[PDB]
Design a protein around this ligand. Sequence first.
Ligand SMILES: COC1=C2C[C@@H](C)C[C@H](OC)[C@H](O)[C@H](C)/C=C(\C)[C@@H](OC(N)=O)[C@@H](OC)/C=C\C=C(/C)C(=O)NC(=C(c3ccco3)C1=O)C2=O
Ligand SMILES: COC1=C2C[C@@H](C)C[C@H](OC)[C@H](O)[C@H](C)/C=C(\C)[C@@H](OC(N)=O)[C@@H](OC)/C=C\C=C(/C)C(=O)NC(=C(c3ccco3)C1=O)C2=O
Ligand code: NI
Ligand code: NI
Ligand code: NI
Ligand code: NI
Ligand code: NI
Ligand code: NI
Lengths: 213, 213
Amino acid sequence: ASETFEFQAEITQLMSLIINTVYSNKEIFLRELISNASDALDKIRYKSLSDPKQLETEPDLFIRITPKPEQKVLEIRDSGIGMTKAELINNLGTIAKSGTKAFMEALSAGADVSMIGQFGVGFYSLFLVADRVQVISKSNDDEQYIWESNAGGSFTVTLDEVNERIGRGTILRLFLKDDQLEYLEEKRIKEVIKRHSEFVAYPIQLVVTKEVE
Amino acid sequence: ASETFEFQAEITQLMSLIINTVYSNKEIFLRELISNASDALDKIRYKSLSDPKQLETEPDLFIRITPKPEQKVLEIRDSGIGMTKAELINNLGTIAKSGTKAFMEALSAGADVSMIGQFGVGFYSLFLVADRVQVISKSNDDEQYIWESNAGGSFTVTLDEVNERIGRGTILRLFLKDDQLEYLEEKRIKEVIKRHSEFVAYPIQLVVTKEVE
Ligand SMILES: COC1=C2C[C@@H](C)C[C@H](OC)[C@H](O)[C@H](C)/C=C(\C)[C@@H](OC(N)=O)[C@@H](OC)/C=C\C=C(/C)C(=O)NC(=C(c3ccco3)C1=O)C2=O
Ligand SMILES: COC1=C2C[C@@H](C)C[C@H](OC)[C@H](O)[C@H](C)/C=C(\C)[C@@H](OC(N)=O)[C@@H](OC)/C=C\C=C(/C)C(=O)NC(=C(c3ccco3)C1=O)C2=O
Ligand code: NI
Ligand code: NI
Ligand code: NI
Ligand code: NI
Ligand code: NI
Ligand code: NI
């Protein structure tokens, strides 16, 4: 029925630094979320070694990118390990994150945004291209939940009685900024993926809507 | 929380005649559901003439066909008028339907299955290719509901706390028979649509998943 949570202070700062920022190489947000997806797919594949039944909820391991042009939305789905309510809460904003400080200090010094991934806060690069995100997620150990943020000071978390059922995993639902609609285009997606996500152990799927004529 | 309803007797007979049937031209089920979609799109476009706000819930008028190969499922979506709980109940199985009798008598006499559409029971041709259907629907005048049938003697109707939100309209979710998986293939869909659905006033979209390599 949907709870509101406060962002740890530094995490709010990080998000502002990013959402309010010029910078050409915004395309990196795609490497970052594909990198996350991949990590999440590794984790369930590995968990499944001693627990084969964990795969039963969704046998197929993939990454799938669905531009929804109509809604100015882009979605990155993975059939990875997914995240519980508690995980969404703790890992995505309430708890003091590993390198949020360190990363901003590095930016102060002239570091390239590109590095965000190496500080373990790559997730937040999605604010380069988006003013709202929903992380929708289904872990084998909990119900499906939606974490939502507009880069403000808080996020909500809501039991998901609204989205298609993910069997297991996570959909990143990016509400793209108006200047950033190029990331809805098939050719632009293939380009970024080919150039900067060359070594991914899982198939990357791209959902394309074509009018039959 | 999901109610069970009985099929009017003749409607049960019709469904058996169809689901238990040889016959080459099964492809007609596609004409029939595209024909329905179109009718449903006409109806809201027309309703919108004196009530422009009816379009607000989903401004775009389209038909969209999404083969889900993984789940052996094919979906035909329309952004048409959609159907209420009561409508799903009355119009799709509990009430004595216009030409269900007449149509079966016509089949007894040697009529081609193709004609089902002209008896106003084309909907049931989907059992040519499918052993389970979910009709999921969102009318402007009610919540989203799922009507479900395996061709048996009954259907259920359930408040939809499980599927993506249709803004307005209907998704036909066909669980294809194992002999009928050709209707998952892009080329097969374009063929049937081009040959037998040549004159449709609305764009027909086909969702294709392609692996980026
Ligand atoms: C040491 O674990 C890792 C953490 C610490 C926890 C958050 C891990 C999570 O706990 C529940 C969980 O184990 C998930 C698998 C989470 C993943 C990676 C993502 O979700 C999925 N499923 O797509 C992502 O939301 C999309 C979640 C937040 C990640 C943020 C903050 C990051 O920028 N980076 C990050 C990692 C990483 C991997 C590759 C590049 O960076 C990473 O390995 C981490 O922060
Ligand atoms: C005189 O209205 C019509 C009826 C009688 C009522 C059912 C109408 C419905 O009441 C609420 C409603 O007005 C919807 C718009 C329903 C549509 C057409 C479909 O849903 C959508 N939205 O895709 C379909 O489920 C997919 C529903 C059942 C239809 C069956 C039984 C049919 O085989 N045929 C059929 C028509 C038809 C049109 C073209 C070819 O055949 C038709 O015009 C009819 O039965
Ligand atoms: Ni539009
Ligand atoms: Ni916007
Ligand atoms: Ni580049
Ligand atoms: Ni499979
Ligand atoms: Ni089956
Ligand atoms: Ni033909």
